[PDB]
Amino acid sequence: TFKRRNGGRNKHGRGHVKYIRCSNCAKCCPKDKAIKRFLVRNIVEQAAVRDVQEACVHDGYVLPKLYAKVHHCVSCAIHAHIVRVRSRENRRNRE
């Protein structure tokens, strides 16, 4: 049985795609098969933004944001709930 039409990755016209290291476990997986989330987070959750802006000496300092692009393998993506097992009918939704 062929579960997916794309085979689990985006690879057309190519023969080889270079792998990447999973952030969680460092398993090697090809760059076109990995689950890739660009995370844009704050240095502090809104619990501690006022009591850190109370301490900024220069007025108007906006707290910078940590930027990262995190890679996962299939097993780590499933186990952390970044992606879920979907129904057969919902497997085809890419939005």
Partner: protein, 211 residues
């Protein structure tokens, strides 16, 4: 342990509007451990906003180096140029393209330095296209223009006036107007300046630029 330590005033040179970036401390002179000449090359890294009372330049981490010390004031000279992690990583996004260039440069005084520029292609208004990519032949042409401008917009006397170009982005805005006919190019800067080597001390040089 901290009772044998004496503080100093760190001062930026006069082409920086504000001065007095802060205070450093050095253990007082002993045998073979002299405060004055013993250290002398502290490297300091202070925001360009703290340094010219202009938050409009909150990026551009200025790297500063102590050339000499005179009687409880650490006299500092411009040592480098760099972006915050957040600013550079704010600029770079998918569905765009990124162009990099670098060139080694001599000023008339013999500072050898690198400059790195970065630019990003601009979506024009009314675009319905989902991505904004130049072609590789275009990508090369812009990089070649980037390098040439660095060469000739540099090759100007010294970091005294050369830094005067780096501050208001005399280079980056001029990159766009230099080559707007090859592809738009928004967010042009000079991302980094690394000083490869400097000439000898030449004490006359310092106080002429320093306060």
């Amino acid at each position: 342990p901290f009772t044998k330590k004496q503080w100093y005033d760190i001062k930026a040179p006069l082409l920086f509007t504000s001065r007095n970036v802060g205070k450093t401390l050095v253990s007082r002179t002993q045998g073979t451990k002299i405060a004055s000449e013993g250290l002398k090359h502290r490297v300091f890294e202070v925001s360009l906003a703290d340094l010219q009372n202009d938050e409009d330049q909150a990026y551009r981490k200025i790297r500063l180096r102590a050339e000499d010390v005179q009687g409880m004031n650490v006299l500092t000279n411009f040592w480098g140029m760099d972006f915050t992690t957040d600013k550079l990583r704010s600029l770079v996004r998918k569905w765009q393209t990124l162009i990099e260039a670098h060139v080694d440069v001599k000023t008339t005084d013999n500072y050898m330095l690198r400059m790195f520029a970065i630019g990003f292609t601009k979506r024009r208004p009314n675009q319905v296209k989902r991505t904004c990519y130049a072609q590789a032949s275009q990508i090369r042409q812009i990089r070649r223009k980037m390098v040439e401008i660095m060469v000739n917009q540099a090759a100007s006397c010294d970091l005294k006036e050369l830094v005067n170009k780096f501050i208001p982005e005399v280079i980056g805005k001029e990159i766009e107007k230099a080559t707007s006919s090859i592809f738009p190019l928004q967010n042009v800067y000079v991302r980094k300046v690394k000083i490869l080597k400097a000439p000898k001390f030449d004490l006359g040089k310092l106080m002429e630029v320093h306060g």
